[PDB]
Amino acid sequence: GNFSQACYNSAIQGSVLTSTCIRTNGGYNTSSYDLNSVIENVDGSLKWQGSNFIETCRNTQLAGSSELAAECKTRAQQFVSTKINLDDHIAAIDGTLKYE
Amino acid sequence: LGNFSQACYNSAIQGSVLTSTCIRTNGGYNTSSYDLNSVIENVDGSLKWQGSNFIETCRNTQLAGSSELAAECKTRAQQFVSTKINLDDHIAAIDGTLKY
Ligand SMILES: OC[C@H]1O[C@H](O[C@H]2[C@@H](O)[C@H](O)[C@@H](CO)O[C@@H]2O)[C@@H](O)[C@@H](O)[C@@H]1O
Ligand SMILES: OC[C@H]1O[C@H](O[C@H]2[C@@H](O)[C@H](O)[C@@H](CO)O[C@@H]2O)[C@@H](O)[C@@H](O)[C@@H]1O
């Protein structure tokens, strides 16, 4: 992961991370990644190893340079605040965001 | 700058998914899909960017023209109204793949 070490100007909109990432040989590339493919809402907590969190979470934002923050529903249908460190698994490879 | 439709053909919408066949940077074609539920919200019956999960409260999605998502979305008063959003605002063709 550790995309924040290779990328700047990051943003979250919905479930999409956008960032400007350095290419292997010099310049930069504007990249995006749909985190809904790799993050699950498990009883109100954002977790890796699943998908589809955006269906039951709201108010997604980037906190700091690499944390996704949101408000997600528990199984009992109550919203709680939750965060996950995207640097755990999101990398930049030759300027493109990828899940590792 | 979005504008995928300038490089893409045979686009279709099914549920929240856009699929299109786009010309690659150096030639040939690639087909890819994009889950618009990641980045479009239903705000009181109107589709808007800067949110997510419109599909939960919208139905009858289709492609209008070459780049417009048309749908019927529920207002706060719980009635379906027609709405459209131009996917060229934010969806681009990047070397033949749809990206935000
Ligand atoms: O329904 C979509 C939802 O399914 C899964 O989440 C379950 C649970 O962990 C959630 O707390 C509640 C919230 O209503 O929904 C499900 O029971 C996950 O796959 C989740 O990512 C997804 O949004
Ligand atoms: O419930 C899912 C729904 O939540 C949000 O939409 C709200 C509002 O704008 C809609 O008009 C009504 C329709 O019932 O629902 C909510 O109150 C948005 O996140 C929307 O994308 C989503 O489908």
Author numbering:
A (entry chain A): 2 to 101
B (entry chain B): 1 to 100
Article excerpt on this structure:
CV-N is a small (11 kDa) natural lectin isolated from cyanobacterium Nostoc ellipsosporum which comprises two quasi-symmetric domains, A (residues 1–38/90–101) and B (residues 39–89 respectively), that are connected to each other by a short helical linker.
I34 exhibits %DFI values lower than 0.2, is at least 16 Å away from binding residues (distal), dynamically coupled and co-evolved with the binding pocket. The binding pocket region is also structurally conserved compared to P51G-m4. Analysis of the polar contacts between dimannose and P51G-m4 and I34Y shows an identical number of hydrogen bonds with the ligand, indicating a conserved binding pose. These observations suggest that the increase in binding affinity of I34Y toward dimannose might be mediated by equilibrium dynamics, which are not captured by the crystal structure.
